[model samples]
Target: DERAVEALIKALKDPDWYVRKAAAEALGRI
Candidate 1:
């Protein structure tokens, strides 16, 4: 599940989903 969650984040950062990626990655860092 660890890698799976990371995969979603990486995929979101593809630049097309910045809205989703920004939220997840920001909270992920916190």
Candidate 2:
């Protein structure tokens, strides 16, 4: 799921803090 990880990485920089946090937390599940 390299693509998924990459997408998440991009999400980590999201303008929304909650979105970033959600993506950061979801990284582990990836």
Candidate 3:
């Protein structure tokens, strides 16, 4: 799951607002 978080970190830079929002929420929950 740690690795998945890393991927999410990359998602934070995603062009889509939805993707960035999800990534931010995921990191916040962690």
Best by lDDT: 3
Candidate 3 TM-score versus the reference:
0.66
Error of 1 at 29 (Å): 19
- Candidate 2's TM-score: 0.79
What C-alpha lDDT, on a 0 to 100 scale, does residue 14 get in candidate 1? 59
Between prediction 2 and prediction 3, the one with superior lDDT is 3
Off by over 4 Å in 3: none
Model 1: lDDT equals 0.65
lDDT of 2 at 7: 87
Error of 3 at 1 (Å): 3.0
Q: Which portions of model 1 miss their true places by more than 4 Å?
A: 18-30
lDDT of 2 by residue, 1-30 (tens): 899899899999889989999999999777
Evaluation by TM-score, superior candidate among 1 and 3: 3
**Candidate no. 1 TM-score:** 0.38
Ranked by TM-score from best down, the candidates are 2, 3, 1
RMSD per prediction, one decimal? 3.7, 0.8, 1.1
Q: Which ten residues in a row have the lowest lDDT in candidate 2?
A: 21-30
Can you write out model 3's per-residue Cα lDDT over 1-30, one digit (the tens) per residue? 999898998899889979999999999999
**How many residue pairs clash in each candidate at the backbone level?**
0, 0, 0
Q: What's the ranking of the predictions by lDDT, best on top? A: 3, 2, 1
Q: Is candidate 1 or candidate 3 better by lDDT?
A: 3
